């Protein structure tokens, strides 16, 4: 031999990102954490009143 090979290689990016907006789905599921608590919080105390 008396052989040195030092090499590099390249990447294939994974799928599932047609557009970044997809993470806005998380902004949705934030909102259905946002839009859920006050329903019961006023529901049970609406039963109280």
């Amino acid at each position: 031999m008396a052989e040195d090979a030092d090499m590099r290689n390249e990447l294939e990016e994974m799928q599932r990102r047609a557009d970044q907006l997809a993470d806005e789905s998380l902004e949705s599921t934030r909102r259905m954490l946002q839009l859920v608590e006050e329903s019961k919080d006023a529901g049970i105390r609406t039963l109280v009143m």
Binding site: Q15, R16, A18, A22, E24, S25, S28, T29, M32
Partner: peptide
């Protein structure tokens, strides 16, 4: 599954 990613977005916004 861009069909199901777009639905994971859209149907759940409808939810």
């Amino acid at each position: 599954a861009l069909s199901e990613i777009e639905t994971r977005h859209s149907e759940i916004i409808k939810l």
